[PDB]
């Protein structure tokens, strides 16, 4: 695949290998609060995750993933703009080289420190994640903006797991964990049709952006920034940043549930 976040193979170059990069439904985007539209049809989002579905943590080089068993409908998202239930498959984070600016989505032109993404795939429609992945209604991602301030105690279990997957390709059992514990107290949101924020960049995602942010301290962020992109044994190359610049809206509408 050979793509990255460095000057050579970064976001500004992705178009070269993946034309969809210049599509009309690309993510992330800037959410202008004055132009959002209240949609009275939106229902509250309901998350129902089973902790025993947590399975492993893995270093994939450009970031780390927390994977969940997705053979059943034990952990699902429902409500919001959906008629069907979406099966949780993973959560991951996005951050930047500085503690102040590292989110993907921005609000009123304001970039936050980091962003949590909780991904699900349409089990009511497709057979597998692989199938669902390039379809318009294939994936649902919840994005939660993180703002540097006080340390957040709910992140602890994830941070301690990091020691075991220091380098690319390392993986470790990660179990008994309910990710809904990471979401803000209120679930009011913004939604728009978009895409995967990194290659292959399929325009298959229905974004759910939470209106309320959660905190994190600069030392917590420094722990993400300390993981390595190289394989074990090689020279150390830190995972400095993994966020893509915002893309043009191209006439999409950002709906508000409030
Ligand atoms: C299978 C799958 O979800 N691939 C991803 N690539 N980008 C994603 S993101 N950052 O928009 O959640 S998810
Ligand atoms: Zn992501």
Swiss-Prot record:
Q: Taxonomic lineage of this organism?
A: Eukaryota, Metazoa, Chordata, Craniata, Vertebrata
Residues at which Zn(2+) 2 binds: 62, 65, 198
The residue ranges of the Alpha-carbonic anhydrase domain are 1-258
Specify which residues bind substrate according to the UniProt entry for this protein. Answer: 197-198
| Annotated catalytic residues | 62
Keywords in UniProt for this one? Acetylation, Cytoplasm, Lyase, Metal-binding, Zinc
Organism of provenance: Homo sapiens (Human)
Question: Which reactions does this protein catalyse?
Answer: hydrogencarbonate + H(+) = CO2 + H2O; urea = cyanamide + H2O
Protein name stated in the entry: Carbonic anhydrase 1
Q: InterPro entries, per this entry?
A: CA_dom (IPR001148), CA_dom_sf (IPR036398), Carbonic_anhydrase_a-class (IPR023561), Carbonic_anhydrase_a-class_CS (IPR018338)
Q: Where is this region: Disordered?
A: 1-28, 238-258
**Per the entry, which co-factors are needed?**
Zn(2+)
EC annotation from Swiss-Prot or TrEMBL: 4.2.1.1, 4.2.1.69
Q: Kindly give the Pfam families that the UniProt entry links to this protein.
A: Carb_anhydrase
Question: What's its job?
Answer: Catalyzes the reversible hydration of carbon dioxide. Can hydrate cyanamide to urea.
Name the positions where Zn(2+) 1 binds: 92, 94, 117
